[PDB]
Design a protein around this ligand. Sequence first.
Ligand SMILES: Nc1ncnc2c1ncn2C1O[C@H](COP(=O)(O)OP(=O)(O)NP(=O)(O)O)[C@@H](O)[C@H]1O
Ligand SMILES: Nc1ncnc2c1ncn2C1O[C@H](COP(=O)(O)OP(=O)(O)NP(=O)(O)O)[C@@H](O)[C@H]1O
Ligand SMILES: Nc1ncnc2c1ncn2C1O[C@H](COP(=O)(O)OP(=O)(O)NP(=O)(O)O)[C@@H](O)[C@H]1O
Ligand SMILES: Nc1ncnc2c1ncn2C1O[C@H](COP(=O)(O)OP(=O)(O)NP(=O)(O)O)[C@@H](O)[C@H]1O
Ligand SMILES: Nc1ncnc2c1ncn2C1O[C@H](COP(=O)(O)OP(=O)(O)NP(=O)(O)O)[C@@H](O)[C@H]1O
Ligand SMILES: C[S@](=N)(=O)CC[C@H](N)C(=O)O
Ligand SMILES: C[S@](=N)(=O)CC[C@H](N)C(=O)O
Ligand SMILES: C[S@](=N)(=O)CC[C@H](N)C(=O)O
Ligand SMILES: C[S@](=N)(=O)CC[C@H](N)C(=O)O
Ligand SMILES: C[S@](=N)(=O)CC[C@H](N)C(=O)O
Ligand SMILES: [Mn+2]
Ligand SMILES: [Mn+2]
Ligand SMILES: [Mn+2]
Ligand SMILES: [Mn+2]
Ligand SMILES: [Mn+2]
Ligand SMILES: [Mn+2]
Ligand SMILES: [Mn+2]
Ligand SMILES: [Mn+2]
Ligand SMILES: [Mn+2]
Ligand SMILES: [Mn+2]
Ligand SMILES: [Mn+2]
Ligand SMILES: [Mn+2]
Ligand SMILES: [Mn+2]
Ligand SMILES: [Mn+2]
Ligand SMILES: [Mn+2]
Lengths: 353, 353, 353, 353, 353
Amino acid sequence: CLTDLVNLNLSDTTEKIIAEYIWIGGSGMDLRSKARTLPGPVTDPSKLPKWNYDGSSTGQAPGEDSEVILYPQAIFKDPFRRGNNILVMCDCYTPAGEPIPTNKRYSAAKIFSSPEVAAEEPWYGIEQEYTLLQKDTNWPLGWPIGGFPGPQGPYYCGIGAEKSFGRDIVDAHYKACLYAGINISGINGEVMPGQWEFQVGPSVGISSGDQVWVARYILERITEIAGVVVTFDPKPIPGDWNGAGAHTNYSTESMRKEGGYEVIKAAIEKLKLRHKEHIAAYGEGNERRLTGRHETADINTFSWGVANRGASVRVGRETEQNGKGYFEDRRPASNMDPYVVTSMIAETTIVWK
Amino acid sequence: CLTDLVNLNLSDTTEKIIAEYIWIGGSGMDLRSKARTLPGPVTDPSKLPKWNYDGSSTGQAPGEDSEVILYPQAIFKDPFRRGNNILVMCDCYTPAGEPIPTNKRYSAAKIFSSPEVAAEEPWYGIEQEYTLLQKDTNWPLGWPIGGFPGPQGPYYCGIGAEKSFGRDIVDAHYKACLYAGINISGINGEVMPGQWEFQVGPSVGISSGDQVWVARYILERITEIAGVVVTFDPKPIPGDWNGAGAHTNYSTESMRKEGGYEVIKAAIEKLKLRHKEHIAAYGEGNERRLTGRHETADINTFSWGVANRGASVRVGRETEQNGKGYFEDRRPASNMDPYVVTSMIAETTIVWK
Amino acid sequence: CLTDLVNLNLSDTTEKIIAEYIWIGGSGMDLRSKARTLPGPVTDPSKLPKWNYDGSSTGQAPGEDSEVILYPQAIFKDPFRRGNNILVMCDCYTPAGEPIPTNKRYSAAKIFSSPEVAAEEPWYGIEQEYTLLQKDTNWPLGWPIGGFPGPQGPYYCGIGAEKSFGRDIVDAHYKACLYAGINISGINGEVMPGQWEFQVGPSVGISSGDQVWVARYILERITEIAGVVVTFDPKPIPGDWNGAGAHTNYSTESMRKEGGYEVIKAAIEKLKLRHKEHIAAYGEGNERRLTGRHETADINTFSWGVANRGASVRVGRETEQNGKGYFEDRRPASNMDPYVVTSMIAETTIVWK
Amino acid sequence: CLTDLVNLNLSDTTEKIIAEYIWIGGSGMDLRSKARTLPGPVTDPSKLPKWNYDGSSTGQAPGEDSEVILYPQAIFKDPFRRGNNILVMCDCYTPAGEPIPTNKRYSAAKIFSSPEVAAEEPWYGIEQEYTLLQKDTNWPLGWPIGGFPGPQGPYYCGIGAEKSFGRDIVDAHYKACLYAGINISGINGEVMPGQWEFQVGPSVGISSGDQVWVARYILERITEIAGVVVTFDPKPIPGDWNGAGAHTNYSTESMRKEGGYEVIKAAIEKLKLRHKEHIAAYGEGNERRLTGRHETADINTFSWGVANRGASVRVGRETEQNGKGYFEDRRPASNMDPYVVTSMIAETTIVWK
Amino acid sequence: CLTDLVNLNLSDTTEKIIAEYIWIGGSGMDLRSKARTLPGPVTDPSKLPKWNYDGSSTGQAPGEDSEVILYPQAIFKDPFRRGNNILVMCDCYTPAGEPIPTNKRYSAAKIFSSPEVAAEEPWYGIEQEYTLLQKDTNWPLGWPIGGFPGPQGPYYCGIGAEKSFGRDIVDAHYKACLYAGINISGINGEVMPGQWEFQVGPSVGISSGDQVWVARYILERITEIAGVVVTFDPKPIPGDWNGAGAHTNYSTESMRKEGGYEVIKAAIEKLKLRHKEHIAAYGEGNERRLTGRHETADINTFSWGVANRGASVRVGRETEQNGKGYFEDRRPASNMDPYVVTSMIAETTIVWK
Ligand SMILES: Nc1ncnc2c1ncn2C1O[C@H](COP(=O)(O)OP(=O)(O)NP(=O)(O)O)[C@@H](O)[C@H]1O
Ligand SMILES: Nc1ncnc2c1ncn2C1O[C@H](COP(=O)(O)OP(=O)(O)NP(=O)(O)O)[C@@H](O)[C@H]1O
Ligand SMILES: Nc1ncnc2c1ncn2C1O[C@H](COP(=O)(O)OP(=O)(O)NP(=O)(O)O)[C@@H](O)[C@H]1O
Ligand SMILES: Nc1ncnc2c1ncn2C1O[C@H](COP(=O)(O)OP(=O)(O)NP(=O)(O)O)[C@@H](O)[C@H]1O
Ligand SMILES: Nc1ncnc2c1ncn2C1O[C@H](COP(=O)(O)OP(=O)(O)NP(=O)(O)O)[C@@H](O)[C@H]1O
Ligand SMILES: C[S@](=N)(=O)CC[C@H](N)C(=O)O
Ligand SMILES: C[S@](=N)(=O)CC[C@H](N)C(=O)O
Ligand SMILES: C[S@](=N)(=O)CC[C@H](N)C(=O)O
Ligand SMILES: C[S@](=N)(=O)CC[C@H](N)C(=O)O
Ligand SMILES: C[S@](=N)(=O)CC[C@H](N)C(=O)O
Ligand SMILES: [Mn+2]
Ligand SMILES: [Mn+2]
Ligand SMILES: [Mn+2]
Ligand SMILES: [Mn+2]
Ligand SMILES: [Mn+2]
Ligand SMILES: [Mn+2]
Ligand SMILES: [Mn+2]
Ligand SMILES: [Mn+2]
Ligand SMILES: [Mn+2]
Ligand SMILES: [Mn+2]
Ligand SMILES: [Mn+2]
Ligand SMILES: [Mn+2]
Ligand SMILES: [Mn+2]
Ligand SMILES: [Mn+2]
Ligand SMILES: [Mn+2]
């Protein structure tokens, strides 16, 4: 019957391809997509046609001048439609060729193009945390309605029906992402029951932001299948339960070479000065998360330590002892725009003095 | 839809591998795991990177010094993720290289390294019993809520919908373990309805403890899928129902060779003297199990017989008549740490006088 | 998820094998099994190890002398575990090598070994009837609770959702048995709604008993999957509903050769004389079945006819007209031990005068 | 239909009466009752017939000598049967006239008979706490199954559907008790959601124990109607939730007269010396309750303060400022026998030196 | 059965009375009560005993100094317990006789005692709006879960099953209050489906605050019976749905006499100057309600008109045309403390210049 049709192999019948054009919508936090048929397979982003959508239905243009243009930027294999079908990550422009206010990729692209950044060859691994919720009631997966599970403790990395809610979704997403070609580096159960993580493994410049959005798209499409809701809300349940962040790990050419640990301290130092204006772009709602409790640092203070999860920045035991590595900015909230955060770290770290 | 993604074959798309790093957490009875992407297949434990986790969320380190280090010790095939993906059993260390208080494998490794033990080449077959429970109500599987099934009798090794609860889970685990490469030697329905057994077949020294933990990991992960809870609690329901033990069967080089039956009696003799201090490590809650009824021996007396299930140690009809074999220490409870019990039998049996 | 693991092909991964050792327990009507791993495939019964079980949990030995020994007698392919895995039918012995009181195969083995029996080469086809029940309520499958279906008539060999309850189970069992290598000759819907039949086709001497037990094992294991209960109770519902019997068909070398119909009458004649002592072994509860109504003969009278289903023995139209064939002893109840009935017919028929 | 019969007025039809004889059973914590028809109304306990019950079904006598005798001690009006029908509180004796081991009223009666006690005229007000549970799952009323409500805080004396579970029962019991003639002094919602209190107001000597038992009888009979379970277990849920005590408030003639506050301290002083042996009779399971947290004092220390709920004994602000009053022994657990606790306080306080 | 006991008439049996002492707790927004038995009826507040509660469980005192004292201030008939039983509204004091920080009645009592205020004889009518919610899901009554009803419009003062949710509760509360003796002036369905109103009719000085609290207590106790939740939250659902306010109508001796309309303008004028510091006490969350839309005035502007529901203060058509009357301060939110608002209007209106 129904999954027989969803999983039809089109390769046996024509050469035609399905391309799913993904973009970011008016809120800057809402993913949108639609699909077109293309005459044959494509591997190069710049050999795909540009397209348009109804900007008036995503809060990005008026009705009388409704067209917004889609620039194909990255191609990944579609894990849902399979065969030769593709997901295409997109950029948003007016018909005049201006990037619209909600296109944060443009500005970020410029920074990673800029030659003294590109030469430093920045690397990001970003750890996406998220919470799963029951549809309609909007209460965390596996929690009883109008009630709570046992207190935090057994949940982090746990196993068992009483401890681990929705591995299904998680394990599915992991494979999906790998197949798609997203550089996904790992997953893990998080502290708060119903909370989970994936990390998009060391990825260079713009492609980090690109991957992280497409990873999010795949996540939510998977939840959709499961009849479950995701939030990227930084602190979804108030009280004695963990919030969710998008820890960004970072390194430059000079940082992973000999005596990079001095360049690390130097970088952290710059970050301290601009804490104020980084917090401002590190995602909204963050005040509710960064409280100094629950493995976060207070929004108002800046700090850094070695194995310290109470800090604003953390530098692994391993990269300290090796005099070379990366550091982890724990400040960005789960609803961070990776384009914004990713480039603004490279900016406050290389260009500015 | 959803199982189509969980069961994707990655072999068709990249060389990459998923490694699921397993460890033991702060309670010493709670398994934890998380997963990372590795660039290609691996068969040798010492060719896998060491890793870390958040010790502060497993009750094994403070927040300000949170890192705990993972030493890959054994590799098995992942029966869930399949293809070339692996489970990796692990060991727990401070960044300074000290084994943390809860790492009972280190001490046990030392004893099986020690040359007069290694030479005796000890063999353990351990019989894990466990009980299956309904999620939330926490009442045994196939029992009616706030009520009991018929009295014990038809359940041991039984068959039929009224006698045999959750064979699904059991049969699955058997194959999983075998596929994984765990030396699993057999299974059986236990005396108490909803109680089951598997034996991790004759395995040498450290690898016994390693296999038994990974087998337990796989059991619980399977129950997770079924939406059922496991306990290793030695006596889960009070009254006229069997408890659960982790009988350890044991033999040395000299015990399975000609006239080993004398070395057996000699061993049992030593064991009687140290009963007090063995009971102390044979798992907590045991007082509720070892009552002398229900095929156990009273906690306070030590005994041993031939075909005697009422005894503290038992020696099979078969190994008596053959003047060579193994004996069965029935004392350890189902929530025994096999590292502790497995090495402490070799210790009280070979080294001490 | 779960059936992916139950159905794993182990052939791709090791040579190892799962052997499911089946025996008969304390009541003489309760099947029991457990499984062990064996190092490679096996086709010869006498190349399988002997094993033991806990006789104290099946009511076959005391706790202090608990071991009972298992002698591998027949091998069949496991239809559940598939691949190279096997079911092993067993025999029950004390550690001294005595057959325990409940081992009726030993005695029957002796009779079919005895040379003037073996030479007559006896043949049994036995027709197992059985009734399917809802779990917990214990009321016949497809019957409304605390109520009855339409009166008997449309059910025998019927088809359709209102007439035919649990064909699923039946059809499954048929293939299962065939695959296993049981000589199964046919199946049919019985007269009472929810009642069914299979026949273990012409099988020689001991192997008849052996097959019929293993057929029953496979039946119940299948109902277990379906969450349904079986009874072999000869009259499960009182009143105007059919009971269940285990009709034994029988023939010797001389009976199927020319003018065997005289040897048949001669046999029937002997059977009439020992009706009293045959009824005594033809299974308990039989008084409730054999009432002279519902295609049975009264327990107290012995009779025989040609196409007569009201008779104690029946001789087909076909084997009458051919002067050679078999006859059908309709007296054994569905909970008959085939070892006892099968050998005792050969005994009262050949040896005794 | 059914409540029309339960509530029939018998006064319109005969003079006859129903007496419900209540006693305490073998565990010393289980109430039992049965009813007899008496020819007319009765107000004097000593004009009621003595009766017997089956001591062998309450664990209080062997089968061959099964009779145990019931002595009517107190009469109350039956709030369930209403009209002229009565509850009768009872005392338990052998046919020889010996009080059986589980009759703690006999001993307590002697102490309140004793003239130097009777003259001091002791007064007890006892505050019974208890917890209401869902039938079968045995989880607290208003809690979600396998989960918890919001943390403690809004529940104590609260109102509202989300805060206040089973007022129905509580309010019913209150009126019931008053109607019955139990001197009930007040009720209140307790700290732990689903936990409640009533106080049996200042009552003299023996009649305190008598009223508290009949009060408990009425409580449970009311829950029975509601299909809800009661526990008097001192700490029914482990962790961060209140236990349940039976605070006993106490005063003597001299304590409520001028400068009784000196006699109070003097009494407290004596109580400190016998803390050890009082804890031994203050009900079993108490170790789990008295932890020093949750408004209790640690089992091992004795303390006392003025407005201090963390203490072993507490003396109200009001009775300090007035130089005369009562004090509150907070040590007895909810499953205290009031006969034992009530007399033993008068004993350690008046007779002993 | 159960409502037979809840509704027992105690008047037939003793003279005793149940008094339900009501107070306000630690949040200043949470009502608490408990009940005591009193020896006979009472009509005069100052003939009731003072009482205490556990301040440590309402967040009003530490554990070691836990006692807080209850001053009976007003008596009403208990509509739940009926007969001669009473609700007692209370005041909160330390044992030293200080009013605790959360006792806003003390300060308000002083202001209405003050002779130039008492002489002006102030009158309040306060209109309590509130929203009804489903237990556990916490979604408005009669709304579908994770969805909305038809847009606002048919709901205000409506009738019918699709328009009018929980009239049951409202109508019941109306009678309850009247019976109790609360001067309740009227009720009405509010604009937002599931939202309701009652007005506590012209009441003088302190007794306004007293009645409004007791009214709220009765409301929530009724919802408790219905298994429904109340919120006094000023804007319980975001978006295009009405918030809830506690409009205070107000008049002085001089304002309802000839040419009071000048004293009204004069009063309004004073209120405009102190708008800033009135908003500060008019209840928390108010920023979310007072938006200028949905019949409110913006928090930051002060305004007033005649028939104007968009204004901060409104003066009826009727009292304008009569040159004498009252005005309506629409600024206070539904979670207003009437003690605070009620006195502070009298203060900013009479005493201050
Ligand atoms: N040289 C590098 N520069 C920047 N990021 C890197 C580098 N090497 C690795 N990363 C990674 O960025 C990541 C950080 O991984 P993670 O496994 O989440 O540890 P974590 O900081 O302990 N997280 P958490 O428990 O969520 O607080 C992964 O994608 C790593 O692959
Ligand atoms: N030489 C040996 N030394 C130690 N253990 C062995 C040896 N040979 C076999 N074992 C085994 O250890 C096991 C014991 O199996 P098992 O039959 O379940 O014990 P049991 O006494 O029968 N059980 P129970 O029903 O739990 O009381 C399996 O792994 C056997 O393979
Ligand atoms: N020579 C033979 N000796 C013994 N049994 C035989 C012989 N030939 C055939 N059988 C059979 O034994 C069987 C008897 O089958 P069956 O047809 O079910 O009995 P029935 O009288 O026909 N029917 P019922 O009304 O269902 O009780 C099958 O295995 C037949 O193949
Ligand atoms: N002279 C007295 N001697 C003994 N008990 C008395 C005396 N006078 C009153 N009591 C009382 O004993 C009681 C104690 O009631 P209670 O209201 O619960 O005080 P509490 O210590 O505040 N309780 P809690 O919240 O459980 O800690 C009632 O029956 C009081 O009437
Ligand atoms: N002199 C007065 N001083 C104060 N309040 C008064 C006075 N006279 C009457 N009230 C009243 O205070 C009230 C205000 O009630 P209400 O009739 O609902 O006003 P409303 O402005 O129509 N309501 P709304 O739809 O909520 O905006 C009632 O109790 C009136 O009887
Ligand atoms: C557990 S952790 N990921 O190491 C700490 C992160 C945490 N979930 C947070 O962002 O608040
Ligand atoms: C039946 S048995 N496995 O021989 C005895 C083991 C039993 N379940 C126990 O109490 O340990
Ligand atoms: C229909 S039939 N198989 O010929 C008769 C068998 C019947 N159920 C019996 O109990 O003998
Ligand atoms: C409010 S209270 N009765 O003072 C608290 C007492 C608590 N339930 C106890 O464990 O004794
Ligand atoms: C009908 S009405 N009271 O004028 C509307 C008032 C509205 N519920 C408010 O936000 O105050
Ligand atoms: Mn991480
Ligand atoms: Mn994390
Ligand atoms: Mn991190
Ligand atoms: Mn075993
Ligand atoms: Mn076992
Ligand atoms: Mn064993
Ligand atoms: Mn047949
Ligand atoms: Mn048949
Ligand atoms: Mn037949
Ligand atoms: Mn109290
Ligand atoms: Mn209390
Ligand atoms: Mn108390
Ligand atoms: Mn109004
Ligand atoms: Mn209104
Ligand atoms: Mn109004």
